[PDB]
Design a protein around this ligand. Structure first.
Ligand SMILES: Nc1ncnc2c1ncn2[C@@H]1O[C@H](COP(=O)(O)OP(=O)(O)OP(=O)(O)O)[C@@H](O)[C@H]1O
Ligand SMILES: Nc1ncnc2c1ncn2[C@@H]1O[C@H](COP(=O)(O)OP(=O)(O)OP(=O)(O)O)[C@@H](O)[C@H]1O
Ligand SMILES: Nc1ncnc2c1ncn2[C@@H]1O[C@H](COP(=O)(O)OP(=O)(O)OP(=O)(O)O)[C@@H](O)[C@H]1O
Ligand SMILES: Cn1c(=O)c2c(ncn2C)n(C)c1=O
Ligand SMILES: [Ca+2]
Ligand SMILES: [Zn+2]
Ligand SMILES: [Zn+2]
Ligand SMILES: [Zn+2]
Lengths: 746, 33, 146, 48, 48, 49
């Protein structure tokens, strides 16, 4: 509302704000001197926080060079006394709160009871050279013989967090709005501890509000927010998402995957909060080096819940332990031997360390099976709910917006579509999805047009009358639905990771049946690190072309086998015994098998095994046949297959490097190249740290989720409405705040 | 404009800062190197 | 210094001093450092080579074990796959450097009930090791040097 | 080179309008700009 | 690399003028603009 | 890092370096923060007075 802001600016509000700042600073000083008015002090800063909130609301929509900021700086310099005094009070309070946690203050306390004399406190403050003489006297007066430094420090710290945040936001907004203001620069230089302390808790998300204008949005960051953001699960998930999206190359839909990743990260955040509390020596040396480089009723229920949570917390450690166990048992398996009779072939263990290898192998296999079972249980407990939430979210969004399940049909194939149609009838469909009333939303959207009865029957609602009564209101075994459980089991049995876990369990069971089956567990070394996974993905990257080339090789070999049978049958004499000669080309199957077995891996053509035709007829014909076979098989087809595989691996590695390079030279949000930001020293670093950070955007989104709708500002309400509309136009989309106001900022 | 990033998918010889659009085998997607 | 000092004990120790030609010229230094430029990926590829050789060794030990005969005289037959370690050493010594798969050293499987199985085994061993893993290592070193 | 030529043709059509001499960079600012530009107007089927 | 250099020489001759070096994009605005330039404006035979 | 920590209190650390008074600069910088006692001990500062 530009009119209201202009009316407020042209009215006499400013004199009232000056007077309010003066009386509030004097009241704050007086209550700081006293001690029994903590309730009045809390009310004062709550009201101060509200006043700064109103000031920021007034500053919303202010242009880089506008009259509003001019009146701000005019009133700031007009009433510099009280505001400077209160900012000094905040500065000394924060400095003392930081000092009490430092070793400088702890090195001067002499009483073990947590008390220090007033003279000793003054001497400590003078040694620290942080507070002036009047400041030290004021701090001494504020404190209630014992100074009670810890209690006095932490009593006012918690209430002052909101007001300090509000004033820090206010000053940051003025500094960013109107640069080159000597009064504003001096005022910012007056208070630097507050800004530094509130810097990790402050966000600078930039969005396009209206009229294609870039605006700065400041939101709230809690300590627990960054505390939970530092876990490596969320960092790894972010890395996978960004790598996948950059390989995809999508630009128009890139924001869609970004929002989906943000929602998945929020769900993972919630789940983490929920679960929060001779030749032997050489072989041994080689195995050790390989491992080293690779490494680089109620009571029962609560006990089960705690065990499941602990297992979920250490899932990666459990997987690493399982891989180590598999390495150990297969290294133990490396000491096997066969003898005709036991000390019908018999597999008997070598004595080695006086027969200690067999019980060790047995215990290793038992422990590996147990660890694998706990691993699959932990995977089901940890990553399955994220998949369930993603699938439910996708289905609900598609049904709500696309409407291809009521107006249209899933069509042929689409097994996922048929599965999603099956669960549509299931009650409590959005069990993991945040919005539990998607059915009512799609009802009011399209069901009345499409039929209030047919749509409700298809959606499997319990009762429309019951829902209306609930809206107008003004055991465990029976509660669980069989259809929902079977749908969850079916969708679990289709996820690739769950299939891999089931294959691992089957391999462990087979190893229990026969110890030699445990060798398949070392295939997990491909998934453990990214290079071997890249090799495996290269193997199947060009599968169609590889199979086509294999088919060409097969048909060429078949044609040459037919030619050899028709004419060159005499020279196919592998056996050197004249008494019982062996004809390798007496039949199509035998000759084709011999060709595919020797002629494709010989490396010099089939002529190496075939007898020399110099002493027999058709010498030139057979020489030409051998030359063309070599040229058309080894030089061409085998080289083509090898080049396909090698170039697939090279292209995959090239993409993995190019994604990183593009992220280092281009940012994710607006995509402006770092060359433009290279003019400013560390400009790209500042941009990627404060301007267009993904972490800042996700923190803002989930803080707006946490904050009530009534408390939203105009920009926050607009961005929330845009998010609810499933349309993202507030993103910068190649527009930068500095670039938009380059002339004025210079 | 005409110059392309190091491992950017180029189009033909030159047309890049590295000026060499070689391909590492039997596949498309020539890139500067 | 220590190599020069030990050269007095044995004259052949002076051959180590040829490494100065490798560490002196820029081209020689680049050639030497090409291995260490992508050492992690090379070691990972060697790890896959060892893992696949182990898998094919235990496969051959379970079945087609009788074909591992490298003794010409039947008076004293030699079973190179009678033990895990011996068969693994034989594989890592012969198959990787053969250039045409493990079937070159092994006798021709003619008339055996596992003829098709042995043929498929040799084919997949060749395709997986010589065509892929050795070529991958060679390409990695070539790309590092380039 | 033959495979590169085929992928080159495919990428050029995914980028070039095949009717005008302006690339998709201009229309990338408007969401679905290239799709709308190549769907109704500047269509070979429409010309035929 | 040698074969690539020869092909690149040919391509640069077919794309960039030998005399001025202005890219073919400038003359691409008019039909047969580069042909007219190479036959009348900056022909080496004409300078000879 | 541990090797550098060992040489901090060495009297001849400023050797081979033009800035032979870096101990004085760091002591002046950190005297207010650390009381000018631990910094002197860490850098040696034999007979500071
Ligand atoms: N929009 C963006 N948000 C965050 N980082 C970005 C963005 N665009 C590009 N980057 C790049 O990402 C890096 C910062 O994020 P990132 O988490 O990847 O850092 P890192 O130093 O690689 O550490 P780690 O990934 O282990 O946290 C920088 O290299 C930065 O240039
Ligand atoms: N002038 C143009 N006329 C038509 N298509 C064009 C033009 N310029 C570029 N294109 C591209 O060519 C495509 C037309 O071929 P397309 O790949 O859609 O064929 P298709 O595979 O047979 O159809 P479908 O998309 O239904 O599977 C357009 O979608 C667009 O990406
Ligand atoms: N300044 C220039 N003058 C002439 N040709 C130029 C110039 N700059 C580039 N070219 C290019 O050089 C070529 C002219 O020589 P060209 O290769 O056609 O000769 P040619 O094939 O031996 O002769 P012919 O005309 O008899 O076929 C054209 O491809 C033209 O685009
Ligand atoms: C309450 N809530 C969530 O709990 C949530 C979410 N997106 C993901 N989750 C988990 N949204 C948008 C939400 O409002
Ligand atoms: Ca409100
Ligand atoms: Zn940006
Ligand atoms: Zn067009
Ligand atoms: Zn010219």
């Amino acid at each position: 509302c530009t009119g209201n802001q202009q009316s407020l600016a042209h009215s006499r509000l400013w004199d009232a704000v000056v007077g309010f700042l003066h009386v509030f600073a004097h009241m704050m000083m007086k209550l700081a001197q006293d001690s029994s008015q903590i309730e009045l002090l809390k009310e004062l800063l709550d009201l101060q926080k509200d006043m700064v909130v109103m000031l920021l609301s007034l500053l919303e929509g202010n242009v880089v060079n506008g009259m509003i900021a001019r009146q701000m700086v005019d009133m700031l310099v007009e009433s510099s006394s009280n505001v400077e005094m209160i900012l000094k009070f905040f500065d000394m309070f924060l400095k003392l709160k930081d000092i009490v946690g430092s070793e400088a203050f702890q090195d001067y306390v002499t009483d073990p009871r947590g008390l220090i004399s007033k003279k000793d406190f003054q001497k400590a403050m003078d040694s620290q050279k942080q507070f002036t003489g009047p400041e030290i006297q004021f701090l001494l007066s504020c404190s209630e013989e014992m100074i009670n430094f810890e209690e006095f420090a932490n009593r006012f710290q918690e209430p002052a967090r909101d007001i300090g945040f509000n004033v820090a936001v206010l000053l940051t907004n003025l500094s960013e709005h109107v640069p080159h203001d000597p009064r504003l620069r001096n005022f910012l230089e007056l208070a630097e501890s507050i800004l530094e302390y509130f810097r990790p808790y402050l966000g600078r998300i930039e969005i396009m509000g209206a009229s294609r204008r870039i605006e700065r949005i400041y939101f709230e960051i809690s300590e627990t927010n960054r505390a939970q953001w530092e876990m490596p699960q969320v960092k790894e998930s972010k890395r996978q998402f960004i790598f996948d999206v950059v390989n995809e190359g999508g630009e128009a839909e890139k924001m869609e995957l970004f929002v989906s990743f943000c929602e998945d990260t929020i769900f993972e955040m919630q789940i983490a909060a929920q679960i929060s509390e001779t030749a032997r020596e050489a072989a041994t040396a080689l195995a050790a080096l390989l491992w080293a480089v690779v490494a680089r009723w109620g009571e029962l229920e609560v006990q089960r819940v705690k065990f499941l949570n602990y297992l979920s917390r250490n899932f990666y450690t459990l997987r690493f332990l399982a891989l180590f166990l598999a390495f150990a048992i297969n290294f133990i398996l490396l000491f096997y031997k066969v003898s005709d009779s036991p000390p019908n072939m018999v597999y008997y263990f070598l004595e080695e360390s006086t027969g200690y290898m067999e019980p060790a192998l047995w215990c290793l296999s038992l422990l590996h099976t147990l660890v694998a079972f706990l691993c699959i249980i932990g995977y089901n407990c940890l990553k399955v709910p994220l998949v369930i939430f993603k699938r439910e979210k996708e289905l609900a969004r598609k049904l709500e917006f696309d409407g291809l399940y009521i107006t249209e049909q899933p069509g042929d194939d689409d097994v996922k579509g048929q599965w999603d149609r099956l669960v549509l009838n299931t009650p409590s469909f959005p069990s993991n999805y945040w919005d539990k009333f998607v059915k009512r939303k799609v009802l009011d959207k399209h069901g009345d047009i499409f039929g209030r009865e047919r749509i409700a029957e298809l959606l499997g609602m319990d009762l429309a009358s019951l829902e209306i009564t609930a809206h107008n209101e003004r055991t465990w075994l029976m509660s669980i639905d069989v259809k929902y459980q079977i749908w969850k089991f079916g969708v679990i049995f289709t996820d690739n990771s769950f299939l891999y876990l089931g294959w691992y369990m089957v391999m462990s069971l087979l190893g229990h049946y026969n110890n030699f089956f445990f060798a398949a567990h070392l295939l997990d070394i491909a998934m453990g690190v990214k290079t071997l996974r890249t090799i495996l993905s290269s193997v199947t990257h060009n599968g169609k072309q590889l199979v086509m080339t294999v088919g060409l090789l097969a048909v060429v070999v078949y044609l040459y086998t037919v030619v050899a049978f028709n004419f060159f049958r005499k020279f196919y004499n592998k056996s050197e015994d004249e008494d019982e000669p062996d004809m390798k080309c007496d039949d199509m199957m035998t000759c084709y098998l011999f060709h595919m077995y020797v002629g494709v891996r010989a490396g010099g053509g089939i002529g190496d095994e075939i007898e020399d035709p110099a002493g027999d007829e058709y010498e030139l014909y057979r020489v030409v046949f051998d030359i063309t076979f070599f040229f058309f098989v080894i030089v061409i087809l085998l080289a083509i297959i090898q080049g396909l595989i090698i170039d697939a691996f090279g292209e995959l590695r090239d993409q993995q490097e190019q994604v990183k390079e593009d992220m280092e030279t281009k940012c994710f949000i607006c995509g402006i190249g770092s060359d433009y930001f290279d003019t400013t020293p560390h400009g790209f670093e500042t941009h990627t740290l404060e301007e267009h950070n993904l972490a800042n955007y996700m923190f803002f989104l989930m803080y707006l989720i946490n904050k009530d709708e009534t408390e939203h500002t105009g920009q926050e309400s607009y961005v929330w409405k845009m998010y609810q509309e499933r349309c993202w136009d507030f993103f910068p989309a190649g527009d930068c705040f500095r670039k938009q106001y380059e002339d004025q900022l210079s | 404009g005409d110059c392309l990033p190091h491992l950017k998918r180029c189009k033909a010889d030159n047309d890049c800062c590295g000026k060499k659009c070689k391909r590492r085998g039997t596949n498309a997607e020539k890139r500067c190197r």
